[model samples]
Target: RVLYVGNLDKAITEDILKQYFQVGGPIANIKIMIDKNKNVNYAFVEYHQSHDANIALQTLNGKQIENNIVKINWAFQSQQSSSDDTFNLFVGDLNVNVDDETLRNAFKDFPSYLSGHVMWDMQTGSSRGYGFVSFTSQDDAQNAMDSMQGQDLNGRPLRINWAAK
Candidate 1:
């Protein structure tokens, strides 16, 4: 299984990531990506087993690495197979105050809800007016879309749609 780790400091390196993530379990690989335009860094950490990845997700998410508090969740792995059966929803029009927990709370009613993340402006450290929510089933995603569409959150209406694969 793979985990997506985000909101990393630009100065953080792949070696640092390996060191921090090793607590979860034996990692197969760690792929770091830098967004030069945004001046932000993120990584995809692949673990040998899902159990280890789950442990990482539980223990490392929101943990501090250097000055940044990293965000971690199951990476949306596409094209390998459909059996994993996870779907992600793109959430737009978020209030600047909305954070990851708030976003997840919005979708908590859905039984298959997996996780949520609010993208941030790396420099300003503010919400980007959008985020993502993941679900373990497409039907639960659709249900969330239908139920949460135009719902008011932190004084703004939500815009929900299926995240592009």
Candidate 2:
């Protein structure tokens, strides 16, 4: 029920994030983190329901908030059961221009794609050339790996494999 929102513009306030994210559904909380020295800013948005989080991810990921394009992904839940079934893929060598939405769109056709996220450098607000994608099962993950490996996205070939647990 929580989403990690990254690459936020420093000027964006919690009120703005609340208002912007309210469109997806009822939010439980909004916590913004800032690093003034490093010029880094980000947030965690918690929804009343996991469904709402999914809505936000589908609708808001990679959308611009003020001057910055935000990347949204399901926040890792450390307390989540280890037996929970999900396969995460590591996508490497992404083009600098590829954002969360672009990466999601590339893998959305695969079965049970849960989420996609492009890791960004908080200070620079740029892609780190890699990201993660989650699917409900290993077969689906492997299918995506086989189908998307070396595929061009924003002029760069993708390197896909099982993400380290």
Candidate 3:
């Protein structure tokens, strides 16, 4: 039920992840993907509980995973646990030029924001034109709606509404 995998090598076999992780530790399972389309050869290692994952993040993140340097942290799990635990909203009439960092700063008015992402068309590397933000709390989501839903910034009318499943 823990989240995220880091400090693993693209060349690492699934066995390696399991073996290395179990050294002086406990591991539930390790899944290293072999899909050709994925960018990073990352994985989702499940532990019987969350303590292992948290400890791994603290002890192994940024440690060598093979040839590559690894960066590990808490992976957002609410999305997997239940979409209900996370708020997704549509942002319309976007600035078109706005990037992820720009969007994050603009929403700084609300303290509820945990993270915001603006996805781009990988082929063109251009913004798909809309993105979503996850709130740390329901109240934060509400704050965003009250303070930013209809507000205009950088010449774009910002529309905020709960997104569809």
Candidate 4:
């Protein structure tokens, strides 16, 4: 698991963070976020285990390091990492009329198909001709890609490919 760490004093380096946060447990890795202007702001700390993260959470929340007060919480994962092994498909050439429900229905009952959604244009309020479909297993995603290519959709051929996260 990962921890969201904020309220840093900018001078804190990766080694300094490891020094302080490792009191709870060993750290697997750390990612410090930098803005466009390259100013250090916050960090994400991935602990070796969930138990270690929990220990840190219980012990280190609101703890002070020098003049900086640290704020900690569970980190939010936006996409699957290499370790996750999640298979996500990119469905392009989608009909503009497609919605999330319709898009998900297209992959119905496929092997380990978990979820799918079409990217919608907020201003136009329509699909952006592309979508994502996720599966628990890579084999299932590959099966869908192999067998479902050139499928007819709204009088158009859908372009299917492996999605990059």
Candidate 5:
């Protein structure tokens, strides 16, 4: 599966992204997307497994790097697929101050949405920086993702996409 990484500094490069994300998984491929203004704003990272992307989701989603808070999310699934996969989403760039109820509430009214939560920090008793949202149907999942990208919660913009899983 693939992951979306955002809020990068101008100095970001494929090597930098590889170095940082390799901590959680083996990167299969990475594409540094250039925004319309021609600056680094985000990138797509493909991992060897869904689990590894999940690890990156939890550990580096909201990590700070040189004043920029990195955001991680599942990348939108391509049509290049068979037809037996379940749809899930990686939600990232969540505010550290958010809680279970708050996170769930964000997507409670979303179409075909089932559940959403931030990974909990066992030691600090707070958000682990990222979470997942599931959809019972592919259309609904795609709809939610299309509508939620760049939407802001509290103050941080949300990054939403299909879970690598």
Candidate 6:
């Protein structure tokens, strides 16, 4: 779960975030966003998987993460350590044609799938050099990630991830 934390009391620290979610389970990492005046509780937390993240959310949602009752949801990208089993991908080198249909069709070769979309520049009406795909089912998304990632699509490679907003 890529957490979005805010409403901090200015004294909160990274250690506080780790210790706060410790009640849920073993966390992968915690990055407390620097929000001046506590305007936004911006942060990113990566758990083992959807389940781990969900567990944390279930246990801690509306609960304090850093002296703030933050909103936690799945991130469009997974930022887990390489030494771990963070089975997600981030699509990159994408073609400008990338859309809901193109990505879903490309993943026709996979099983379970979740949500994904390529960011487009409003001014240019073109891809923003990146896209995110999530596979809640795990199998299909993983298949898409392994097979389609870096395979080549309209002269591009995809960077798949477990987290896709």
Q: Assess each prediction's global lDDT (C-alpha) against the native.
A: 0.88, 0.88, 0.69, 0.81, 0.79, 0.64
In candidate 3, position 103 carries an lDDT of 88
lDDT of 2 at 83: 29
Which is superior by TM-score, 2 or 6? Answer: 2
**Residue-level lDDT tens digits of model 5 in 1-165:** 789888887677888888888887788999988666644478899989989988888888888755688988897653222234557888898888877677788887878877676777555777766777777788988888888888998798888877764
Measured with C-alpha atoms, the lDDT of residue 32 in candidate 2 is 95
Tell me the TM-score of model 5: 0.47
lDDT of 6 by residue, 1-165 (tens): 455554554566778777776666677888877865535546677766667777777776776544456666665553322323323457777787787568667765466555556667655767777766655555665667667756877677666555532
Selected candidate, larger TM-score, 1 vs 5: 1
List, residue by residue over 1-165, the lDDT tens digit for candidate 1.
889999999989999998989988999999999886775699999999999999988998998899889999898753212225679888999999999999988888888988888888755889889988888888878999999999999999999999756
Worst 10 residues of 1 by lDDT: 76-85
Q: In model 3, what are the clashing residue pairs, if there are any?
A: none
Pairs of residues at least 3 apart in sequence or in different chains that clash in candidate 5? none
What lDDT tens digits, residue by residue, belong to model 3 across residues 1-165? Answer: 445675456688988777656642577777776657544577777777666677776776677777877665555542222245776666766777988888889886677676777766655768777777777677778778777877886788787887643
Q: Which sections of candidate 4 miss by over 4 Å?
A: 1-85
Error of 3 at 93 (Å): 1.5
Q: Candidate 2 vs candidate 3: which has greater lDDT?
A: 2
How far residue 103's Cα lies from its native spot in candidate 4, in Å, is: 1.0
C-alpha lDDT (0 to 100) for residue 53 of candidate 1: 96
**In terms of TM-score, how similar is model 4 to the real structure?**
0.49
How do the predictions measure up, each by TM-score? 0.49, 0.49, 0.46, 0.49, 0.47, 0.42
**C-alpha displacement of 32 in model 3, angstroms?**
26
